[PDB]
Amino acid sequence: ESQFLKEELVVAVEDVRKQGDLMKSAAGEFADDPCSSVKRGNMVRAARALLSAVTRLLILADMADVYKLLVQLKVVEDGILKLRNAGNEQDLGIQYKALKPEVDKLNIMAAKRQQELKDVGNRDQMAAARGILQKNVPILYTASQACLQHPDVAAYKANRDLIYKQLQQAVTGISNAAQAT
Amino acid sequence: ESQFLKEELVVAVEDVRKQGDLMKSAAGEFADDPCSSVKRGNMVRAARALLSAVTRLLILADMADVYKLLVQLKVVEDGILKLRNAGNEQDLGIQYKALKPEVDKLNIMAAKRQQELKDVGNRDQMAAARGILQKNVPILYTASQACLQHPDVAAYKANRDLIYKQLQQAVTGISNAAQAT
């Protein structure tokens, strides 16, 4: 986690609040005296400063969201690899327990963004990626489990790592789409 | 003249005023409860609507200015042609009187925009164009005057029309630069 962005985000809201005031008054003085040269330009320069403040806010707010998502992402990432490298059906069962929820949270956040991404293509990648992720997390479990029981069947290891590979890919796919709009 | 834009411009200021309010409150509720999911999104959607309203305003305000300038422009335009086609040193002297001020007003407005245009090149065209305009309006007078005194000297007519041509060009140059930034 990193709340430096949540802190920055509030400060941003202040400038938007201050500028918003200066805008309100300049706007008022203009409405009462609309044929006024001076009063008008003051309203324009106000509107400009209000615009900068507002875009700086919207952009920053978007980072905050994407970032938040990416952190849940790196969590699930390391989980998948820790699940693969499990050496006992002990730690393996331990991990899967710790990871399942972390996969669910990531799934939720993922869904949300999916909604906000504008172009539908990206929205599809998100959906698809979240699907594979959803389906294989369990399968990777049963797969890397088998390898632990039949240590000499190279065929199982190959299978497991293929599932892991695809799973990791879905994770990045989610990350990739998440930064679309 | 056309004040439909001055009217539209006020209505525009209202939406910016209304949205500005909705922004202020959503912004406030967020600052008091910043870790809030809901309160936050409300602040974002507010900021969006505030942004549309503000840009719609700034653009419209810019048209209003450019348009205003263009109207003084069409005035000076017809003046220059009416000065050329004068048939007596009577009407000619009449026109020049009526036009001189109209050239000065146009000159003032021109100067202003010059300041606001961002890229310097355009700012130069404006300056240059305003210069030629400034210098030749008088010369066109003395020129189209001579033609009236020596009606059979094709050479004078040629000269006069050349001055008129250049003068008209400066006018359009002003118009052209004025719509730069």
Q: Rounded distance, CA A177 to CA A124, Å? A: 9
Tokens for B23, please give them.
Answer: 């922004």
Residue A60: partners with Cβ closer than 8 Å, 6 or more residues away: A5, A8, A9, A12
Say whether residue B45 is in contact with chain A using an 8 A CB cutoff.
no
The CATH number of residue B33's host domain is: 1.20.120.230
- State whether residue A35 is helix, strand or coil: coil
| Cα separations in angstroms, B129 against B8, B82, B171, B172 | 31, 20, 7, 8
* Cβ atoms of A135 and A90 closer than 8 Å: no
Interface test with chain B among A33, A36, A48, A50, by most B beta carbons within 10 Å: A50
Closest CA to A48 of B61, B136, B113: B61
* Cβ atoms of A23 and A47 closer than 8 Å: yes
* Cβ atoms of B61 and B27 closer than 8 Å: no
C-alpha dihedral (B150, B151, B152, B157), degrees to nearest 10: 90
Q: How far is B42 from chain A (nearest CA, A)?
A: 12
H helices of chain B, in order, are 4-32, 37-84, 89-116, 120-149, 154-178
Resolution, Å (one decimal): 3.0
Q: How far is B130 from chain A (nearest CA, A)?
A: 22
Between chain A and chain B, the number of residue pairs with CB atoms below 8 A apart is 74
Question: What is the number of other CB atoms lying within 10 angstroms of the CB of residue B87?
Answer: 8
Tokens for A134, please give them.
Answer: 């959803």
Q: Which residues of B touch A55 (CB under 8 A)?
A: 51
Q: Rounded distance, CA B141 to CA B93, Å? A: 8
Chain mean position to CA B167: 18
Question: What is the number of other CB atoms lying within 10 angstroms of the CB of residue B15?
Answer: 16
Tokens for A50, please give them.
Answer: 């209000």
Q: Rounded distance, CA B45 to CA B36, Å? A: 15
Which of B137-163 are b and which e, b meaning 16 or more Cβ less than 10 Å from the residue's Cβ?
beebbebbbbbbeeeeeeebbebbeeb
CA-based torsion, B49, A108, A174, A57: positive or negative: positive
Would you call B55 and A50 a contact, using CB atoms and an 8 Å cutoff?
Answer: no
Domain count, chain A: 1
Would you call B61 and A54 a contact, using CB atoms and an 8 Å cutoff?
Answer: no
CA-based torsion, A92, A94, A96, A99: positive or negative: negative
At which residue do the structure tokens 């109209």 appear? Answer: B102
C-alpha dihedral (A108, A109, A115, A116), degrees to nearest 10: 170
Q: Rounded distance, CA A34 to CA B9, Å? A: 9
Q: Roughly what angle, to the nearest 10 degrees, separates helices B37-84 and A4-32?
A: 40
Give the long-range contacts of residues A160-163, CB within 8 A, separation 24 or more: A160/A84, A161/A84, A163/A136, A163/A139
Closest CA to B46 of A21, A16, A6: A16
C-alpha Rg value of chain B to the nearest Å: 25
Q: Rounded distance, CA B161 to CA B181, Å? A: 32
First to last CA, chain A: 23
Say whether residue B58 is in contact with chain A using an 8 A CB cutoff.
yes
Query: By residue range, what is the domain housing residue A65?
Result: 1-181
Tokens for B115, please give them.
Answer: 């300041």
Q: Pick the residue from chain B with its C-alpha nearest to A40.
A: B61
Q: Rounded distance, CA B140 to CA B146, Å? A: 10
Residue B151: partners with Cβ closer than 8 Å, 6 or more residues away: none
| Cα separations in angstroms, B158 against A130, B8, B66, B140, B146 | 79, 47, 34, 12, 12
Phi, psi values for residue A3, rounded to 5°: -100, 10
* Cβ atoms of A3 and A68 closer than 8 Å: no
Closest CA to B110 of B132, B98, B127, B96: B127
Tokens for A153, please give them.
Answer: 């069947």
Q: Which residues of A touch B6 (CB under 8 A)?
A: 34-35
Q: How far is A116 from chain B (nearest CA, A)?
A: 12
Q: Rounded distance, CA A34 to CA B6, Å? A: 8
CB-nearest to A58 from B31, B34, B48 is B48
Q: Which residues of B touch A6 (CB under 8 A)?
A: 34-35
Tokens for B172, please give them.
Answer: 């359009």
CB-nearest to A47 from B16, B24, B27 is B16
Tokens for A97, please give them.
Answer: 């327990």
* Cβ atoms of B31 and A13 closer than 8 Å: yes
Question: What is the number of other CB atoms lying within 10 angstroms of the CB of residue A30?
Answer: 23
- B76 by Cβ neighbours in 10 Å (0-12 / 13-18 / 19+) ranks as buried
